[PDB]
Amino acid sequence: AEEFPVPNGFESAYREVDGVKLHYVKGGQGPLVMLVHGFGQTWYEWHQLMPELAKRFTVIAPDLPGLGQSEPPKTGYSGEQVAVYLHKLARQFSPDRPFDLVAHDIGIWNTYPMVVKNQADIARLVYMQAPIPDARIYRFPAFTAQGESLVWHFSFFAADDRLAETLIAGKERFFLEHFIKSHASNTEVFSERLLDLYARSYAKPHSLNASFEYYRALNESVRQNAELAKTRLQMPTMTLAGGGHGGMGTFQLEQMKAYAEDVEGHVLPGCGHWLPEECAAPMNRLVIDFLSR
């Protein structure tokens, strides 16, 4: 019944949060670290980091609402709405201590509002490989002198008429493999077995739709964040980005400098978008050291 194999010593479980049944994988002991995945993926993208982190922390990795084995949200897909589910989930497990947060891709979109509104609950923050929704996203190019651009998919996924679901249905494995590899530097880490697992998961009709609903809410999140951003983040923050094909480069740290007072950043040469898989060992090391300081 599990969509992905659970690491030894971890449990797959469910918690109801505001009427929404969320799936997560949990292990370890100590202060809580929540890990939040992004588009095309599930909790499983963290499966190499989780056992190392569980040596020193309690580690929880949820499926975003509607993705993996988590139920769709009953409110909506904008960042402020989804962030409520994730914040209350973390609070069920760390009610008496601030917790750490690591997020990738749209996991950023779905956590930033709860970080900025509940700063006393967040001990340390790691964000990798996606902009915080704001006006800067309107500057990315539609097309480049080398071919397809990094984020033309924002428009593809946000289009109405269920454009993305209709074109991708029946071709979910084909599309996801193209999407992953077109934003990767290191494609060999994506075995046919691994692509099969991710494709089977997001091909569930409610999960295919949920994937794109995050993008259909992106302009709403941008508008939400315009007000939230008047309060800068005060906790220690680290950004990570790939320096290779598919990576955000220096954008990640430069944007975060406008949001956070105490921020450090690293660009990983030879790595693209999918840092936990393409560049697991150095990504894991940087996260662990930053969180363990």
Ligand X SMILES: OC[C@H](O)c1ccccc1
Residue numbers of the site for a copy of itself (CB under 8 A)? 135, 137-152, 154-156, 158-161, 163, 166-168, 171, 174-175, 178, 182, 218-219, 222
Enumerate binding residues for ligand X (CB under 6 A): 38-39, 105-106, 130, 150-151, 153, 183, 273
Which of 106, 148, 149, 144 has its CA nearest to residue 128?
106
122-128 and 237-242 as β-strands: parallel, antiparallel, unpaired? Answer: parallel
- Structure tokens of 136? 């800067």
Please count the other Cβ atoms lying within 10 Å of the Cβ belonging to residue 199.
18
Picked from a copy of itself, ligand X, none, the partner binding residue 168 (CB below 5 to 8 A depending on kind) is: a copy of itself
Tell me how far apart the alpha carbons of residues 192 and 87 are, in angstroms, rounded to a whole number.
Answer: 34
Picked from a copy of itself, ligand X, none, the partner binding residue 39 (CB below 5 to 8 A depending on kind) is: ligand X
Element housing 193 (H / E) = helix 192-203
Residue 168 beta carbon to a copy of itself: minimum distance, rounded to whole angstroms: 7
Picked from a copy of itself, ligand X, none, the partner binding residue 218 (CB below 5 to 8 A depending on kind) is: a copy of itself
Taken as a whole, the chain contains a residue count of 293
User: In sequence order, which residues have a C-beta less than 8 Å from that of residue 197 and are 6 or more positions away?
Assistant: 3, 4, 44
**Closer to a copy of itself at the Cβ: 11 or 160?**
160
**Closer to a copy of itself at the Cβ: 110 or 237?**
110
Residue 158 beta carbon to a copy of itself: minimum distance, rounded to whole angstroms: 6
The CA distances from residue 182 to 40, 88, 131, 150, 245, in Å, are 13, 35, 18, 9, 8
DSSP, res 179: H
Residue 167 beta carbon to a copy of itself: minimum distance, rounded to whole angstroms: 4
CA angle 27, 24, 82 (to 5 degrees): 130
Picked from ligand X, a copy of itself, none, the partner binding residue 97 (CB below 5 to 8 A depending on kind) is: none
- Structure tokens of 265? 């950043």
Picked from a copy of itself, ligand X, none, the partner binding residue 38 (CB below 5 to 8 A depending on kind) is: ligand X
**Closer to a copy of itself at the Cβ: 178 or 232?**
178
Residue 169 beta carbon to a copy of itself: minimum distance, rounded to whole angstroms: 9
Residue 242 beta carbon to ligand X: minimum distance, rounded to whole angstroms: 10
